[PDB]
Amino acid sequence: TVVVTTILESPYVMMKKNHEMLEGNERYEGYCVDLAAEIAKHCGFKYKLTIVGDGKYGARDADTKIWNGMVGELVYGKADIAIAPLTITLVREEVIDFSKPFMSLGISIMIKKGTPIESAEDLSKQTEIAYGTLDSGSTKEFFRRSKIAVFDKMWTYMRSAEPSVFVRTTAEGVARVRKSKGKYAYLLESTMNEYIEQRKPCDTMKVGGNLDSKGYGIATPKGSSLGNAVNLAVLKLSEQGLLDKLKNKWWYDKGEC
């Protein structure tokens, strides 16, 4: 049985409202739950979905040097595959493998409606409105490493801001936007931002274009016997239209806003 690490992040993996009456994989629903089923079918394996123990995507701890989150679960042999909104990055590709992308995204800005910010440059040129990112993910590392003038200015501020502008979970960042009376903006991936913007309480907005352009991939440990097959499966699902079918299903706008 293949151990699949993943993360509770809507609409990728979500606990069903009736999860108590259910066991195993049937406890969960979402884009990545459907994707896991399709990959497993095409690759011919049985699997168990497991939510990442520390609730993190994955970064290499600065002093400790140890990987956390889903990345760490792969690196240290606790899981066989990650099927999640896990961003393909250079530092990760040094220690794990990724399929070609199954979904596009870029870093984006979420504000509470009415916040006088329209761009990353707007954020960088002021301090009245605080802004931050998720801990232990690709967005924070993006800002840490960027030499683009605006993004570097943003990083210089975020790293030293106090109270801390970083959050432990996407939900914490979104809640902070909603409760901060326009004084906190959140930097998060466009396909989470967009999902949230279309749903009640309809009090957030995505502003400006995306800051970058990348993708999520299915990740395996180096030398995994699954790597090649999983990549070909993603490509087949892409060419079959299945990935777009799943995206359109899970991001379907029911017109709540």
Ligand X SMILES: O=c1[nH]c2cc(C(F)(F)F)c(N3CCOCC3)cc2n(CP(=O)(O)O)c1=O
Ligand Y SMILES: N[C@@H](CCC(=O)O)C(=O)O
Ligand Z SMILES: CC(C)S(=O)(=O)NC[C@@H](C)c1ccc(-c2ccc(C#N)cc2)cc1
Q: Say if CB 26 and CB 13 are below 8 A apart.
A: no
Exactly one of 221, 234, 246, 250 binds ligand Z (CB under 6 A); that residue is 234
Beta bridge partners of 5: 50, 82
For the record, the structure tokens of 196 come out as: 């949230």
Contact call for residues 136 and 143 (beta carbons, < 8 A):
no
156 binds, among ligand X, ligand Y, a copy of itself, none (CB under 5 to 8 A by kind): none
Task: Check binding of 214 to ligand Z (CB under 6 A).
Answer: yes
| Of 137 and 217, CB closest to a copy of itself | 217
Please tell me whether 225 is known to bind a ligand: no
Contact 57, 169 (CB under 8 A): no
Number of residues engaging ligand Y in binding (CB under 6 A)? 10
The one among 12, 57, 131, 186 contacting ligand Y by CB under 6 A: 57
- Max alpha carbon distance in the chain (Å)? 54
Annotated binding residue at 139?
A: yes
Which residue do the tokens 């949230």 mark? 196
Residue pair 61/82 in contact by the 8 Å Cβ criterion = no
> Is residue 137 near ligand Y by the rule CB under 6 A?
yes
Residue 112 CB burial class (10 angstroms; 0-12, 13-18, ≥19): buried
Q: Say whether 85 counts as a known binding-site residue.
A: yes
Residues 153-172 that bind ligand X (CB under 6 A): 170
Return the number of other C-beta atoms located less than 10 Å from residue 88's C-beta.
17
Task: Name which of ligand Z, ligand X, ligand Y, none residue 191 binds, using a CB cut-off of 5 to 8 Å depending on partner kind.
Answer: ligand X
**What is the closest distance, in whole angstroms, from the C-beta atom of residue 20 to ligand X in the complex?**
25
Q: According to the 3-state scheme, what is the secondary structure of 91-111?
A: HHHCCEEECCCCEEECEEEEE
Stretch of 14-22, 43-51, 113-121, 130-138 contacting ligand Y, by CB under 6 A: 130-138
Check the annotation: does 27 bind a ligand: no
Q: Is residue 116 marked as binding?
A: no
Nearer to ligand Z, 147 or 181 (CB): 147
Identify residues 71-90 at the interface with ligand Z (CB under 6 A). 88
| DSSP-assigned letter for residue 86 | P
> Residues with Cβ < 8 Å from 249, sequence gap 6 or more?
31, 34
Q: Is 57 in the site for ligand X (CB under 6 A)?
A: yes
* Residues tagged in the binding site annotation for L-glutamate: 85, 87, 92, 138-139, 189
Binding site for ligand X (CB under 6 A): 9, 57, 85-87, 137-139, 170, 188-189, 191-192
Binding site for ligand Z (CB under 6 A): 88, 100-104, 213-215, 234-235, 238, 243
